[PDB]
């Protein structure tokens, strides 16, 4: 989370 | 002529003028909004609150961090942090003199470019420059060679440097950080019967983490000691009275660094990433990095962390290698003092990103110069 | 492509071997009047696997098994008790779990019986 | 040889022998005491009443729940529930055969240990075992992979499982539950002029909540429909005559799940916690959890809740992911059927906590085995 | 009578019977173990999983490669790969007929000897034989003269041969391989905002590398083309939805071969090592090696790699020398087809390492015969 | 790494 995809 | 600095930390904003030993203003990186209706008339009660003002009214505010893992999620919110940083906290115009910024390595290019797109258009600084948060620590320590460990509230990197030469092949990034310690600390307290399940309640658990937790040089020995002896148990006075007492939870969460198996991250650990990053380097470089292991940034204030890290790397590292971990008292700001130093260099005056060059090349000018 | 006709699925040797595993185990099960039409799905209940070990090993299970499982978990209990028995039999098994045997991952069930052919001969 | 089961729900007690499809006895988790003097002579009228007997005499009894948010407040009271559960409801001795218990995740360690301290000393079962209320639901559904939503009267958890591997990093807990729906339902009825302001009056409002409320697939559309059309208005015959009629209150309270802004809890919501918990897991695991979203326990009987939850997660979740929410009719007991199944396993016979091991290790034996 | 073959690749296991055009079974060279606790009862869930079964459950498994850079780190783990290779994948006994193995040149003697120590004791084959992975490629191509480029997931060698005479003075070894491409591909995606930081997440990045990356015949021209034109941008559907889109990263990592300055290895490059290895040979030999430049093994499937390598060596090589690079479609297996051919020779029956000779001479018999 | 010493 807070990434454009994974996380 | 003097250029200001803004750390833009993942959990704390730290800004001040260059050539200054201590920063002018520091405030948490939070923006809050009311979750209740406004009954009063002529009360003000506007939408947004940031900084320590938000902690004052946190009871009726839901706090959302605009910066997360060194990555910006809410851009309109982060714009408010900078407006509060310059006008409200420092009371200084940005248009008069340029600004120095920091950001963690391996961030996405959009964060690295969009960060620049906001300054020149919104605030219109005369120039700007971005720098990796790790490199600044050397300037503070005053040594060309070493391996740096930022440990900020968002991310830790473990990058080695050899006579000022950064190696991108050896650099590392691990998202484990203080918010994971707080979120994990909020979890294990459920065991003791204390429940903190809101954004406002998170800040007290963060406050508990700062002044009361230690690294537990020997984890397995100390856990058995905690059950047998109640000496480690201490109390903290959260607001609303309700005194509390934490025992083995006092040192359970900082162990998440050395082994993240508790939180579940498939990572080697903080001790082994520094061991991995150094082994990625050439053989001749390894000697100096062991001798110069800089410890900086937040999350490194747990007492004895230098002892745990020295004890731990020594087991993995071979004999005959002297390990000296540099954990100065002035850390939690060493990234900033590097900014005051880095801006003070006369050579550094050429490396700014001026307004006139932005319009010519656009926001992609950052990558080639920075 | 022609470079890997076998690796995709349904090669001749995969089917010829599967037919061979089916005939061998059934002959031992003639005493209990049990037949295995399809090795993939017939071992889902796991009772046939328990009966096969009773004939070959001539021993009794160390844990009692369910007579008929209706739910999924009781099926895995029957198969898990089976694999744990082979450990007591001093047989080495790698990467054959109760979930795969019930789900019929045909690449793995054939490996389970092949270990029994070489051990029991 | 057969071991009995006791759910020990936060709002309802459900106990029965293992290997049984339906439970033997169910009664509310309430203990009442008179709030009036006893004028009659030779009347009995002792201090404590529990179960459906309390609902019979609730008019002159003040009801206090011993179990609250999955946490036990009155221990002497909860001891009476178990004595009534075995001797009065089931008419079975606990000393003959062991018992299976359930409890919600992240409860305090005292509840998890003290629960064990009472059984062996008071009732003296031959053995005992505790299990997280979520895991049992898989046994009932007969699937190894899935994400479970208990929604009991005390708490909801939203824990994911992948081939039987529980992930403590992804587990969640939210105190919003049926008592908050009842307490909120007691509040909004004040709007319609109906007042329920006592413990006995609470139970009628709970009874109204069961058979008459629905989830309102489209909240904003249905609210405008409620004011325009009176078709949704229905009546309920509370005792004392006084028929009543609820309109938009019929579906206002169950919306507190998807948005707790009404009751004021700083929570994301039931739909987003399942979205948050799944995102905490690895990338490969997310596909199966969307396909297997188990719905269990009380509070999930509102008609169309599977449609609202499927419609809602689909908006947040990305395309190409098939979302199938499993809401079997046998829920409100699925935690129990898992107990009948879990006790039926022959493998499970090793996992009991026997009397002889308790005296050796004490009440701290629960954490390592359970 | 037929002897089986086992490639034992540094990133992929490929085994089949001799005299066969296609291999019987192929599976990745991975062993995984759970990083989470097992909540279910009677679930199986044993310690080790290998092959495609590990990719099925990779979400809750941490994957460690037993073979690394053509060197075995975990011997107990590699023993499990062979047990799975024969019993589970092929369903064939090793004791009945001998086995053919492969290994990269200049490996340590312990790997070359210990490889033999395991077979005769654990599996007890009637005989065995090891062969350099390069030489087998000629058998597949059916030509006596040429220079081979394995490019396996662990290592690349660039060995020349002249009428079947191997020259140890001209042989080369470079550790750059696919795992470095994957590890580098995991790095540069951080630029686009995609983060893959786990063993399970590594496999998706490897899957992205296979079907989507190309060699970029003209690097400097294509980079300027990527920024100007978005035609090269394509998307890949990783699990968990979350579609992604890579642009210049699509072809940035395979360029690490021709220039490893990106990853930081002090190496000349793949194009120049073949140029260096050929120049180490006699003058008369250079003509045939340029005419016969065999391309084999994995990592050579990037479209146009024959064009890039032909264009590149042509610049370094002198005029009048015809350069023809043989990149057949059947590569990624050519080392195996050489094994099926090499075992098929009747002359080859003398070169086996039998059981009776092992006990007489010990495990040092490999070096003199092989 | 994966060598008996350097790497
Ligand atoms: N005395 C302390 N002991 C332990 N942790 C601390 C202490 N002071 C601050 N921290 C932690 O450090 C974090 C702030 O890190 P910081 O230095 O701001 O990094 P950055 O500048 O990259 O944001 C906080 O989230 C807090 O939990
Ligand atoms: N038909 C129904 N419709 C709506 N809610 C219901 C219905 N039946 C029961 N409930 C709610 O479910 C709650 C009981 O939950 P329960 O299944 O006992 O969870 P637990 O077993 O964890 O206590 C009650 O408080 C009640 O409000
Ligand atoms: N179509 C493809 N395009 C690009 N790379 C590929 C392709 N297929 C496989 N690879 C790469 O080849 C590697 C496998 O090499 P392999 O042929 O197994 O060598 P070895 O047999 O020596 O292990 C993998 O790590 C993968 O990244
Ligand atoms: Mg910092
Ligand atoms: Mg329940
Ligand atoms: Mg190869």
């Amino acid at each position: 989370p807070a990434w454009l995809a994974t996380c | 002529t003097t250029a200001l600095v803004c750390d833009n930390g993942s959990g704390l904003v730290k800004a001040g003028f260059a050539g200054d030993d201590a920063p002018r203003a520091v405030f948490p990186s939070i923006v809050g909004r009311p979750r209740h209706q406004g009954v009063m008339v002529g009360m003000g009660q506007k939408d947004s609150y940031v900084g320590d003002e938000a902690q004052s009214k946190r009871g009726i505010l839901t706090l959302k961090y605009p910066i997360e893992h060194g990555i910006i999620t809410n851009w309109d919110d982060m714009e408010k942090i900078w407006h509060h940083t310059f006008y409200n906290e420092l009371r200084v115009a940005p248009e008069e003199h340029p600004t120095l910024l920091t950001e963690a390595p391996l961030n996405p290019k959009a964060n690295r470019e969009k960060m620049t797109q906001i300054m020149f258009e919104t605030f219109n600084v005369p120039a700007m420059y971005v720098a990796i948060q790790a490199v600044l620590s050397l300037y503070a320590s005053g040594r060309t060679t070493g391996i740096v460990l930022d440990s900020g509230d968002g991310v830790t990197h473990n990058v080695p440097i050899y006579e000022g030469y950064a190696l991108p092949h050896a650099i590392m990034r691990l998202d484990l950080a203080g918010r994971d310690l707080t979120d994990y600390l909020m979890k294990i307290l459920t065991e003791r019967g204390y429940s903190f399940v809101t954004t406002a309640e998170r800040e007290i658990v963060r406050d508990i983490k700062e002044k009361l937790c230690y690294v537990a040089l020997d984890f397995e020995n100390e856990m058995a000691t905690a059950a047998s002896s109640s000496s480690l148990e201490k109390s903290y006075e959260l607001p609303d009275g309700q005194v509390i007492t934490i025992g083995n939870e006092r040192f359970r969460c900082p162990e998440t660094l050395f082994q993240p198996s508790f939180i579940g991250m498939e990572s080697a650990g903080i001790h082994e990433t520094t061991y991995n990053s150094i082994m990625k380097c050439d053989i001749d470089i390894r000697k100096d990095l062991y001798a110069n292991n800089v410890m900086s940034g937040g999350t490194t204030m747990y007492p004895g962390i230098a002892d745990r890290m020295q004890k731990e790397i020594t087991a993995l590292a071979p004999s005959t290698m002297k390990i000296k971990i540099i954990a100065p008292p002035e850390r939690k700001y060493s990234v900033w003092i590097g900014g005051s130093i880095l801006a003070s260099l006369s050579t550094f005056q050429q490396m700014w990103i001026t307004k006139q060059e932005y319009d010519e090349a656009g926001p992609s000018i950052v990558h080639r110069k920075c | 492509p022609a470079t890997e006709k076998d690796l995709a699925e349904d090669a001749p040797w995969k089917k010829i071997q599967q037919n061979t595993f089916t005939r061998w185990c059934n002959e031992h099960l003639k005493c209990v009047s049990k037949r295995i039409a399809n090795l993939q799905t017939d071992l889902s209940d796991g009772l046939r696997l328990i009966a096969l070990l009773e004939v070959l090993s001539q021993k009794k299970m160390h844990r009692k098994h369910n007579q008929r499982p209706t739910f999924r978990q009781m099926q895995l209990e029957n198969v898990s008790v089976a694999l744990e028995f082979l450990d007591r039999e001093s047989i080495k098994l790698v990467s054959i779990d109760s979930k795969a045997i019930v789900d019929g991952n045909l690449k793995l069930i054939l490996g389970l019986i092949w270990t029994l052919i070489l051990h029991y001969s």
Side-chain angles (χ1 to χ4, degrees), chain A, chain B, chain C:
Chain A
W3 265 107
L4 194 276
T6 189
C7 127
Chain B
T1 61
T2 301
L4 79 165
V5 177
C6 182
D7 197 0
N8 190 358
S10 295
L12 186 66
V13 176
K14 299 184 286 294
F17 295 165
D20 190 359
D21 292 331
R24 298 292 194 83
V26 173
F27 63 95
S29 180
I30 56 175
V31 66
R33 294 181 181 178
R35 64 181 178 86
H36 295 286
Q37 64 184 357
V39 68
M40 294 294 172
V41 177
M43 188 65 203
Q45 54 190 22
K46 63 179 74 175
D47 60 356
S48 66
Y49 292 102
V50 300
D52 289 345
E53 295 85 357
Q55 288 182 353
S56 179
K57 313 174 168 62
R58 65 192 176 193
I60 62 100
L61 273 74
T62 187
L63 298 173
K64 294 181 176 67
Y65 275 84
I67 189 71
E68 186 177 1
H69 294 287
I71 297 165
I72 295 167
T73 60
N74 296 114
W75 291 101
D76 59 355
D77 288 331
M78 191 67 206
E79 184 178 1
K80 293 181 182 180
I81 301 298
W82 293 343
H83 185 77
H84 181 76
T85 302
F86 298 162
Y87 294 96
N88 295 114
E89 292 290 327
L90 276 74
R91 279 92 62 174
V92 68
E95 294 179 353
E96 293 179 353
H97 56 277
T99 185
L100 182 63
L101 276 293
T102 71
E103 60 91 24
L106 296 173
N107 288 319
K109 293 174 72 175
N111 189 0
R112 187 173 176 85
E113 292 179 353
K114 182 66 180 293
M115 198 151 53
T116 304
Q117 187 272 332
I118 294 166
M119 291 293 175
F120 296 160
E121 291 181 353
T122 302
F123 296 99
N124 192 359
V125 296
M128 188 277 289
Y129 183 76
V130 180
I132 295 165
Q133 184 176 180
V135 55
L136 282 71
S137 296
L138 272 39
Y139 298 100
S141 296
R143 63 182 65 256
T144 189
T145 301
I147 186 166
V148 178
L149 202 152
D150 214 28
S151 64
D153 197 4
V155 67
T156 189
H157 15 297
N158 293 319
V159 71
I161 295 167
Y162 184 65
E163 293 177 350
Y165 291 101
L167 335 189
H169 64 86
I171 195 165
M172 311 263 309
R173 194 170 183 280
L174 182 63
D175 292 331
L176 183 64
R179 295 184 187 177
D180 290 330
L181 296 175
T182 301
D183 291 331
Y184 181 74
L185 183 60
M186 290 168 72
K187 184 177 183 292
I188 60 171
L189 291 171
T190 59
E191 293 198 25
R192 280 197 156 269
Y194 305 94
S195 166
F196 297 100
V197 71
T198 62
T199 41
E201 288 174 352
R202 182 176 292 171
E203 294 293 328
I204 294 89
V205 176
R206 183 179 63 80
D207 192 0
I208 292 165
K209 183 175 73 175
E210 291 179 354
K211 64 180 75 173
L212 188 62
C213 292
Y214 63 96
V215 69
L217 180 61
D218 292 331
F219 181 75
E220 293 179 353
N221 291 319
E222 188 67 26
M223 290 295 289
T225 301
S228 179
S229 178
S230 178
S231 66
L232 278 297
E233 291 180 353
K234 287 175 72 175
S235 296
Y236 181 75
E237 292 180 354
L238 61 87
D240 110 321
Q242 292 177 335
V243 298
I244 74 177
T245 300
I246 59 172
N248 58 7
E249 293 85 3
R250 183 177 174 183
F251 64 92
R252 184 177 290 173
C253 68
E255 184 63 26
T256 305
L257 276 72
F258 295 97
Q259 59 186 358
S261 296
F262 295 165
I263 191 166
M265 291 176 71
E266 183 280 335
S267 178
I270 302 299
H271 67 279
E272 188 174 0
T273 54
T274 59
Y275 182 75
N276 289 320
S277 64
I278 294 166
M279 290 293 172
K280 290 180 181 180
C281 297
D282 292 90
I283 61 171
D284 184 1
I285 298 166
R286 298 165 204 189
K287 183 174 174 66
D288 292 331
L289 297 177
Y290 293 162
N292 290 318
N293 189 357
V294 176
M295 189 67 73
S296 176
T299 310
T300 63
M301 290 292 175
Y302 296 98
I305 191 167
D307 292 330
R308 179 66 181 274
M309 190 63 72
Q310 185 176 2
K311 187 264 184 182
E312 185 63 26
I313 296 166
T314 301
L316 295 173
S319 296
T320 310
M321 294 296 102
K322 298 294 290 184
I323 297 163
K324 294 181 176 67
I325 296 167
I326 296 164
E330 65 184 1
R331 66 188 185 274
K332 189 173 73 174
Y333 294 99
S334 296
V335 299
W336 182 74
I337 291 88
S340 67
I341 293 166
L342 183 63
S344 179
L345 275 70
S346 296
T347 167
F348 183 74
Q349 297 293 321
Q350 297 293 321
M351 293 180 183
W352 292 101
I353 297 166
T354 60
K355 180 68 176 177
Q356 64 89 30
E357 188 175 3
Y358 180 77
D359 292 330
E360 184 64 26
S364 66
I365 194 68
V366 176
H367 298 286
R368 68 185 70 187
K369 289 176 72 174
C370 180
Chain C
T3 300
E4 55 268 16
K5 292 182 181 180
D6 291 331
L7 297 174
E9 190 174 1
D10 295 331
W13 62 272
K14 292 183 182 180
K15 183 63 69 176
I16 292 165
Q17 287 177 356
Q18 184 179 3
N19 291 318
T20 301
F21 291 107
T22 300
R23 291 184 180 91
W24 181 69
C25 62
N26 287 318
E27 292 292 328
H28 294 88
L29 295 172
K30 298 291 180 68
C31 63
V32 297
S33 297
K34 292 181 180 179
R35 185 175 176 85
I36 295 165
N38 190 358
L39 184 63
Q40 185 176 2
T41 61
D42 288 330
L43 295 173
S44 296
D45 60 355
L47 295 173
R48 279 74 176 274
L49 183 62
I50 300 298
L52 183 63
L53 296 173
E54 289 289 326
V55 175
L56 295 173
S57 297
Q58 294 180 356
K59 292 181 181 179
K60 298 292 184 182
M61 298 301 293
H62 61 91
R63 287 177 183 177
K64 294 181 176 67
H65 65 279
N66 290 318
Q67 297 294 320
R68 72 286 191 189
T70 301
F71 292 98
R72 184 181 187 76
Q73 296 293 321
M74 291 184 286
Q75 293 178 356
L76 297 171
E77 183 280 335
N78 291 319
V79 177
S80 295
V81 170
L83 296 173
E84 290 178 354
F85 181 76
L86 278 72
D87 292 331
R88 294 177 65 85
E89 188 61 26
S90 298
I91 296 166
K92 187 179 263 75
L93 293 174
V94 175
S95 302
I96 187 67
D97 59 355
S98 65
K99 184 176 183 293
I101 295 166
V102 173
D103 292 331
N105 203 160
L106 186 63
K107 164 197 281 183
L108 275 177
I109 292 86
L110 275 74
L112 182 62
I113 306 300
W114 183 256
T115 301
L116 296 172
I117 294 166
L118 298 173
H119 183 74
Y120 294 102
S121 66

